[PDB]
Ligand binder design. Structure first.
Ligand SMILES: [Ca+2]
Ligand SMILES: [Ca+2]
Ligand SMILES: [Ca+2]
Ligand SMILES: [Ca+2]
Ligand SMILES: [Ca+2]
Length: 312
């Protein structure tokens, strides 16, 4: 006879779920539309029209949608597959119907780990930062809404830092000092709860300097010194101090607390007689030299030297 019946699906739409762990060729859904108008015209030919985006395919005669060749399914991905049941009458006398498949990609067994907003974090702290002061909230959220367990794993042997098990706030647990340790680099972890479900991340704490160390003089350098009389710019002796702080806070500058019209001092701390010294006038000069770090909010140190002038 003629073509008299339209190839029809039983439903309008299909919600079906797909996973990350799937491989090419794995069956997604068997769609079967009835035409039942027997002839060439009773014989159906399926086809995805649009919305597969290269990650899906249907077998023409069977009506079976499968994962396409060579594709990796990204998680949390929407797809809407319009699939067309075409009957095999001539093009003139053809009939068509449509059906839409609504798919979402999931994680393997639908449970990713909890993920951090970043893979690395760069912090900065002053060694002077108050104990208990919060450094960083590590709010790593969990796709499925599971409860999170935070904890540091490596990079903190001291436990100088405390990461709240529940809240993910990173407080400071013991007092910082920069000379002890100049920077910490932690490894931190969120837990889904099961072993498969745990992400990692790295925090890079960098401690910055305060002037909390006065320049200390070398203990062994000579304090009891000699000089020749009747000589301007004559060498007397040398002092030396150091500062375990850094920057301008590390640089030491030598100054004289007395006798600065008589004696002078260099950048390096060498002391010279600025004028023609004399034994008949003054054979005991008890001089005090001062080291001051060249810093904002500076610190001082003193050293009384014992200079006794000789003649020859
Ligand atoms: Ca038909
Ligand atoms: Ca999870
Ligand atoms: Ca310090
Ligand atoms: Ca200092
Ligand atoms: Ca310091």
């Amino acid at each position: 006879s003629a073509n008299d019946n339209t190839p029809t699906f039983p439903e309008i739409s299909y919600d079906v779920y797909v996973y990350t762990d799937m491989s090419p060729g794995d069956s997604v859904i068997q769609l079967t539309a009835v035409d039942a108008d027997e002839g060439s015209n009773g014989e159906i030919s399926y086809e995805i029209l649009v919305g597969g985006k290269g990650d899906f395919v249907i077998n023409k005669t069977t009506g079976l949608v499968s994962i396409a060749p060579g594709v990796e399914l990204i998680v949390g991905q929407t797809y809407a597959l319009t699939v067309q049941a075409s009957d095999n009458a001539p093009p003139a006398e053809r009939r068509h119907s449509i059906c839409t498949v609504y798919t979402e990609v999931l994680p393997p067994n639908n449970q990713s780990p909890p993920r951090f907003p970043q893979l690395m974090y760069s912090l900065e702290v002053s060694e002077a930062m108050r104990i208990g002061a919060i450094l960083l909230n590590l709010q790593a959220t969990d796709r499925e809404g599971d409860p999170i367990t935070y904890a540091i794993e490596n990079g903190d042997p001291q436990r100088v830092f405390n990461l709240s098990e529940t809240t993910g706030i990173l407080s400071l647990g013991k007092a910082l000092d920069r000379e002890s340790t100049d920077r910490y680099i932690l490894i931190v972890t969120a837990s889904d709860g099961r072993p498969d479900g745990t992400s990692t991340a790295t925090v890079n704490i960098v401690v910055t300097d305060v002037n909390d160390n006065a320049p200390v003089f070398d203990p062994y350098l000579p304090r009891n010194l000699s000089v020749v009389e009747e000589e301007a710019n004559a060498f007397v002796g040398q002092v030396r101090a150091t500062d375990p702080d850094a920057g301008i806070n590390g640089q030491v500058h030598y100054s004289l607390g007395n006798f600065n019209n008589l004696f002078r001092i260099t950048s390096n701390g060498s002391i010279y007689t600025a004028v023609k010294l004399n034994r008949e006038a003054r054979d005991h000069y008890e001089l005090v030299v001062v080291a001051t770090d060249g810093a904002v909010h500076p610190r001082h140190s003193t050293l009384t030297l014992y200079i006794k002038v000789l003649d020859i």
